[PDB]
Amino acid sequence: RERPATPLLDRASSPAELRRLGEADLETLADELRQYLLYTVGQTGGHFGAGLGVVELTIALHYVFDTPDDRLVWDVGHQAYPHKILTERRELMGTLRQKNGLAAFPRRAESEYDTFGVGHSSTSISAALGMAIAARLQGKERKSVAVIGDGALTAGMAFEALNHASEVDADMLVILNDNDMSISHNVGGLSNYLAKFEELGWNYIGPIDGHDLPTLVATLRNMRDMKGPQFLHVVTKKGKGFAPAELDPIGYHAITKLGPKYSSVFGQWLCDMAAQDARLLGITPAMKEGSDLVAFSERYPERYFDVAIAEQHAVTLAAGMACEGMKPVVAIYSTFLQRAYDQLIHDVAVQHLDVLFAIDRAGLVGEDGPTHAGSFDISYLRCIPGMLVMTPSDEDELRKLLTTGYLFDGPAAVRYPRGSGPNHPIDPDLQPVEIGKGVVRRRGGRVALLVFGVQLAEAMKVAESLDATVVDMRFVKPLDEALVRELAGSHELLVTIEENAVMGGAGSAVGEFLASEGLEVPLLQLGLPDYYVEHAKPSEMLAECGLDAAGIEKAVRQRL
Amino acid sequence: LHEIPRERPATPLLDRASSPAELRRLGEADLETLADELRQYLLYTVGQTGGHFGAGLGVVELTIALHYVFDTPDDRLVWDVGHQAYPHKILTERRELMGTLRQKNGLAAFPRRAESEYDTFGVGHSSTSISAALGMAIAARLQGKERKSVAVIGDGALTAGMAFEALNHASEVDADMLVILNDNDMSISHNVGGLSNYELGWNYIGPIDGHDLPTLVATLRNMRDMKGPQFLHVVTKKGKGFAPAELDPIGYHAITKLTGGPKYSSVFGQWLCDMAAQDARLLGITPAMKEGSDLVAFSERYPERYFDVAIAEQHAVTLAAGMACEGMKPVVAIYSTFLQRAYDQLIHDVAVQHLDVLFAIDRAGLVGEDGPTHAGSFDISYLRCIPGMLVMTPSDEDELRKLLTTGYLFDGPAAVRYPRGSGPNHPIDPDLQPVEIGKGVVRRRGGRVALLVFGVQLAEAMKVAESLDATVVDMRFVKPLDEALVRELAGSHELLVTIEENAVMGGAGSAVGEFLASEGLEVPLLQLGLPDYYVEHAKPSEMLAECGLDAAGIEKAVRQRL
Ligand SMILES: Cc1ncc(C[n+]2csc(CCOP(=O)(O)OP(=O)(O)O)c2C)c(N)n1
Ligand SMILES: Cc1ncc(C[n+]2csc(CCOP(=O)(O)OP(=O)(O)O)c2C)c(N)n1
Ligand SMILES: [Ca+2]
Ligand SMILES: [Ca+2]
Ligand SMILES: [Ca+2]
Ligand SMILES: [Ca+2]
Ligand SMILES: [Ca+2]
Ligand SMILES: [Mg+2]
Ligand SMILES: [Mg+2]
């Protein structure tokens, strides 16, 4: 495709210009906007289907509300490409999700029309409420509007926000963008009720057709000046306007521009262990596709649990299953495990319950940017007593360490990144490895590289030119102290490498052990720096952070 | 009743109901006399040891009925939070152990699995019961076992987001479980919330009188045998049967068994008021902990800038984010152990956007008889790894005031952590002045050993330092760490010692170690802090001594390294 002809959209580069068009033009503007959207997303890749579902709703909102003075908050923000296109950024969409281009989601630093950097779901009601409370105290006459999906509304913090808005009699509008969809279909008790609020203290209106610009513009006009907590139920269709996205809402949730993934390796381990042990239970907070429980859910429907977007519940539910003697596996991205932290600590680890966490998207995740980076799980997990914390270096180690944490009688974490690995051979057996034991991959001298994770291949390259010792550390928390102690006595430099924050990370565990035993060897900690890495392709981000061979080699040489 | 008995009461029927099995052999005509005896024993023993008071009083009839109608321990009973579960413990082979309650080596504060097969789920934090119960019911049905599952959740606990996530899921799996809403119109403070002022797939019964044993047994029997998501609305009174407690539900939430400086939370409360008197932008947030965090005076003087979000730690932090987007200045008062539940909101909504939000982290460190479920053991570890966080550890009351001011005036996310209880009782500067960020204060010049203290062990460290003639630093700042001072002491002394009331793993001491390693400074480093296990409940002094964090334990560790 090439740049579609869109003369009307070209007269609506900002809400004020859009607000100078006539209602008779909005209908045509929608077709134009859908065309430009389809065009640019095909040029760069990105999220697709949900943006198409809110083209009409996004036009109406900027037409009826005094944005940017009126505050508009988008939940998740993956459906916000139309919003960006109408807020001075249409002509920059060709840079979307590229280094130094537009970010994946609304970002305050990127435009005055983005009230709240989003990425994680279910924060919009809370943020809109806070803006509304502040606006009221300062006597401003601002509208506060939150657009939340029926999937994002399943999170507990959205219930908390709706309860609190009722309490403070907040003048805000919550717009429920109900399209019956999540990434997968929306499965949950609330989804069933949405198919068929006022009790909670909200003035409910709708449902209305979210693709009826005349109705949308009239409904919004009326609700725009009503007082107190207002709730508009709108019904949209994911992929509206593109036939094969309407047919395939899951596949067209996001598209690419016009060796097995680690998550696939996890999924076959899950199926293989389930065939061998009837105790296994697989849990995901609405990420069946991403974490890849697809086969598992089809082959063992009775042992598969999609808890919706409820990371907290996912974890405490696993704890309860562990009380009865089952073996739950919580599949969760490193960034989303931040939201279940208290359940991991209080309900699982304090009780030393037997729960395995399969921590995907560990490290840098690329175009989705810093809201989704898996930068912290080794730091936040390893300070927790009882936690077995593991960092596989390739597909085969992922399988083995899954097996090892699974069989371990206690809470265990295996983290691994998005994408593929060095494509080494995978042993089909299902046997564990000894806990707390590293593996020496290269016997060298002078400098030793203690690798926790998938930088091992890069460290081996470094090691051929330096003749370094290379250790495939497998465990962070049950640290292999004996190995570290001998390495510290036989080398002049220990170098730790990890795709995790340097502060509090795996290298610091080595450092703590060094300090406690009075071992005086020099130590160089390589890992993620103390700032939020800007979106780019994963290799660009790794290079920026010095976690490619060139970066590792340079830092090692300069230390020596 | 009007007095707490000082001598063990006569409880002939209670003595015949030492476990549910024998409780179930009594007759309906006896349960109401059992309840009266249970209530008397409860008052007696809680007056002997201290403990949670009013919430158990209100579930005395409910607990009797439950163990009478349900086949416990085979049927799964899960108590939410667990502070109301003393009667549950009295009826489950522990009545004669209640005299050890909340003491070192005695019964714990909450139900705990390793303490009794009658405690299906260790609790302390709230709102986990529906999840844990739904988890047990799913397993039971897959193992083909016919057991019942029951969660007893208070109206306060039900304001939490996870409880909603659990109700939505239970209805979706069509789980065979009973949720009982123990509704007494009360949290710790009055229950403030939209849910308070008041289909998802459950079968709702009630409300019913939670103190009428015959309706309870009748209804419970009925619902024990119904299928699918079952939901019983029961209404109780906090303090039922102890007049003074029904007249003051807040003051009798917990009691002491039957002089110093201000509490750190009281210092915070005073700081919050003074700073609100001079800045009209300041907003105070607590998730239902107005008393504990001590926003009492603030909430009375500045009602329009005080926000209690109920037991909703997550909304609390993201609300603050939004307040700061409009130029207001939110202060989130939150316990270390409870900030664990809003970690994602701090990181993604606050830290990633560098929003101006101050976190006053109370109950940092060991918290005493409440035991490991409430310990503030990790906040230094889980916050210092987050980019953009200013992380601060005051050593006394005046330091607390100064670092609150520093964190507030700082434009961005700041955190000030402090323990429960009182400090060394040093003069407090009435002014509102900040200190320079990232700079420690040399409080003693010695030699050979340098103590780098992050927080309230400073006084104990100063005692060891005078005995050893050591150098002592009051570090004040973990995350913008005083790199120049550490480096100076590393060349000057033979041993650096780090002291903090936080896990050694990932703690402030390891921030020092990270710094030494990156500059290749090779000085011996001894890290004192909290060990890598869960410290069993005791008096705070007893827990701190177990961890080596009093003057004697510090000196022993130092002198032993030397
Ligand atoms: C806390 C959290 N967990 C998981 C995700 C992964 N995720 C990205 S989009 C999405 C589903 C969106 O569903 P919905 O709210 O209805 O938006 P829609 O696409 O249906 O318009 C999910 C689960 C997330 N963004 N945040
Ligand atoms: C996540 C969390 N936040 C805060 C607390 C503090 N807390 C302990 S007990 C209590 C009140 C709970 O009220 P409720 O559930 O209604 O039981 P009641 O005391 O009325 O019987 C609170 C807020 C907690 N236990 N957990
Ligand atoms: Ca796709
Ligand atoms: Ca083999
Ligand atoms: Ca060789
Ligand atoms: Ca160790
Ligand atoms: Ca530093
Ligand atoms: Mg949806
Ligand atoms: Mg209550």
Numbering used by the authors:
A (entry chain F): 38 to 233, 245 to 306, 318 to 619
B (entry chain A): 33 to 230, 247 to 306, 316 to 619
Per the authors:
1-Deoxy-D-xylulose-5-phosphate synthase (DXPS) catalyzes the first rate-limiting step of the MEP pathway. The enzyme is responsible for the formation of 1-deoxy-D-xylulose 5-phosphate (DXP) by condensation of pyruvate and glyceraldehyde 3-phosphate (D-GAP) in the presence of thiamine diphosphate (ThDP), Figure 1. DXP, in and of itself, is an important metabolite in not only the biosynthesis of isoprenoid precursors but also in vitamin B1 (thiamine) and vitamin B6 (pyridoxine) biosynthesis. Native MS data on paDXPS confirmed that the enzyme exists as a dimer in solution, which is consistent with the crystallographic results and suggests that the dimer is the biological unit in vivo.
Similar to other reported homologs, the binding site of ThDP is located at the interface between domains I and II with the pyrimidine ring facing domain II and the diphosphate moiety pointing toward domain I. ThDP adopts a chair-like conformation; the pyrimidine ring is perpendicular to the thiazole ring, which is, in turn, perpendicular to the diphosphate. In the paDXPS structure, the pyrimidine ring of ThDP is π-π stacked against Phe395, while N3 of the pyrimidine is forming a backbone hydrogen bond (2.9 Å) with Ser158. Residues His115, Asp187, Ala189, Asn214, Asn216, and Lys286 are coordinating the diphosphate/Mg2+ part of ThDP. His115, in paDXPS, is positioned to form a hydrogen bond with the diphosphate of ThDP. The H bonding interaction with His115 specific to paDXPS seems to be compensating for the loss of the interaction with diphosphate caused by the change from serine to alanine in position 87. The loop spanning from Asn216 to Trp250, contributing to the ThDP binding site, exhibits a conformational change between the holo and the apo structure of paDXPS. In the cofactor-bound version, residues As217, Met218, Ser219, and Ile220 fold around the diphosphate moiety. The coordination of the co-factor bound Mg2+ by the side chain of Asn216 and the main chain of Met218 appear to stabilize the loop. The ThDP-bound structure also shows the participation of the ser219 and Ile220 side chains, with the latter showing the potential to form an arene-H interaction with the thiazole ring. In the paDXPS structure, the closed conformation is stabilized by interactions of the ThDP diphosphate/Mg2+ moiety with an asparagine-rich region of near the active site.
